[PDB]
Amino acid sequence: HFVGKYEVELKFRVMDLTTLHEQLVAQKATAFTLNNHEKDIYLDANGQDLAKQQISMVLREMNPSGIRLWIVKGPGAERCEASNIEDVSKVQSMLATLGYHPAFTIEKQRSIYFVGKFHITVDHLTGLGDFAEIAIMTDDATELDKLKAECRDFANTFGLQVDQQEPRSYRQLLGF
Amino acid sequence: HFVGKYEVELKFRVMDLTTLHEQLVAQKATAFTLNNHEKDIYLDANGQDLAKQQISMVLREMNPSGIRLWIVKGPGAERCEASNIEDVSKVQSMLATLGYHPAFTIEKQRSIYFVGKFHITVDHLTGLGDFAEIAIMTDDATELDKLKAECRDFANTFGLQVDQQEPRSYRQLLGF
Ligand SMILES: Nc1ncnc2c1ncn2[C@@H]1O[C@H](COP(=O)(O)CP(=O)(O)OP(=O)(O)O)[C@@H](O)[C@H]1O
Numbered sequence: 362h363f364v365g366k367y368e369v370e371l372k373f374r375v376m377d378l379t380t381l382h383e384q385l386v387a388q389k390a391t392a393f394t395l396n397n398h399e400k401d402i403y404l405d406a407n408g409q410d411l412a413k414q415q416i417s418m419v420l421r422e423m424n425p426s427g428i429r430l431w432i433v434k435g436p437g438a439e440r441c442e443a444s445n446i447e448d449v450s451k452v453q454s455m456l457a458t459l460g461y462h463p464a465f466t467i468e469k470q471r472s473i474y475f476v477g478k479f480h481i482t483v484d485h486l487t488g489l490g491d492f493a494e495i496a497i498m499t500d501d502a503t504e505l506d507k508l509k510a511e512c513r514d515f516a517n518t519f520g521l522q523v524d525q526q527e528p529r530s531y532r533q534l535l536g537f
Numbered sequence: 538h539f540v541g542k543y544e545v546e547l548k549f550r551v552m553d554l555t556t557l558h559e560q561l562v563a564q565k566a567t568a569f570t571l572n573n574h575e576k577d578i579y580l581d582a583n584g585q586d587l588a589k590q591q592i593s594m595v596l597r598e599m600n601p602s603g604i605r606l607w608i609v610k611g612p613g614a615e616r617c618e619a620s621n622i623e624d625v626s627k628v629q630s631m632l633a634t635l636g637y638h639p640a641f642t643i644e645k646q647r648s649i650y651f652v653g654k655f656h657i658t659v660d661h662l663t664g665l666g667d668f669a670e671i672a673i674m675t676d677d678a679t680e681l682d683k684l685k686a687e688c689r690d691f692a693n694t695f696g697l698q699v700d701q702q703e704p705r706s707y708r709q710l711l712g713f
Pocket residue numbers: 363368372401428430432441442443444445498529530531532533
């Protein structure tokens with residue numbers, strides 16, 4: 362379900378979890394992972410070299426699913442690739458050797474559902490509240506156009522409205 | 538078997554493969570991989586940033602074992618860390634995003650054996666000949682001299698003499 366170099370996404374603040382969950386129930390959404398605590402360590406060079414290029418690099422641990430990912434996001438906000446990793450500390454030390462060191466951490470509760478080709482990701486962050494992201498994976502930049510708007514069609518059928526859209530990343534929201 | 542941020546290693550030209558193999562049987566070596574094709578893609582930044590720090594970074598595929606490794610050697614002597622990865626192409630693209638691109642590729646045939654704490658590799662490189670590496674990984678910097686001396690003793694035991702020692706790396710031997 363996670364194949365491709367691009368994650369076409371639309372993110373929204375969620376005003377009621379009840380109606381969101383009813384729609385998930387309505388549309389026969391498949392649960393992939395539910396209520397995982399996700400801890401994301403963001404790494405950068407000592408002069409913020411990656412952020413100066415619109416790139417984020419993260420080591421993510423998700424519990425209790427046990428999933429560990431190395432993620433490189435950017436440049437831009439569709440480009441995203443990740444790799445499952447066995448050992449977060451081994452990868453972190455290897456990256457430190459290359460000059461990347463922890464810069465900050467973002468924690469969240471996350472659930473991920475599927476409806477056909479769409480991912481619906483439901484997040485809760487301590488300060489900030491509830492969010493949902495509609496996303497579609499692709500490997501072909503030559504098809505990015507259709508997908509977004511389609512995340513918009515799906516989001517339109519889903520009760521996630523423009524007035525609630527949130528274009529900022531979590532690092533942007535948190536001042537990192 | 539492959540635990541540590543330090544790797545003590547001695548590489549030898551092999552003048553007599555028959556003696557080496559006969560000693561592998563006599564010493565009850567266990568084969569970890571036999572006659573694998575190993576393709577190593579060396580990666581660096583456009584300005585050779587890693588080489589300038591005596592760091593090498595490799596994505597290795599070994600067939601038919603199916604082992605895939607991301608390896609960061611250095612900076613300088615005796616430092617090496619590796620992680621298993623599921624997909625070379627995927628990590629390669631991730632590293633390309635960070636600015637590291639294929640600089641050159643080395644191919645070889647390699648068998649890897651264990652005798653107690655020691656690793657013995659038997660390599661053949663088409664333009665160059667037959668080599669064997671004797672190696673021990675550790676996290677402890679205080680024993681590196683002892684371990685290297687143990688490797689040299691161990692090697693003599695396979696008919697690999699002090700005078701067949703090869704301090705140059707394959708990348709150096711191949712003009713990279
Ligand atoms: N279990 C899994 N296996 C493989 N890849 C996965 C995965 N779970 C997620 N991914 C991939 O890794 C990417 C991670 O990106 P996101 O989770 O969207 C960052 P985020 O925390 O939402 O922050 P942002 O809004 O601040 O950018 C996903 O787009 C997806 O492609």
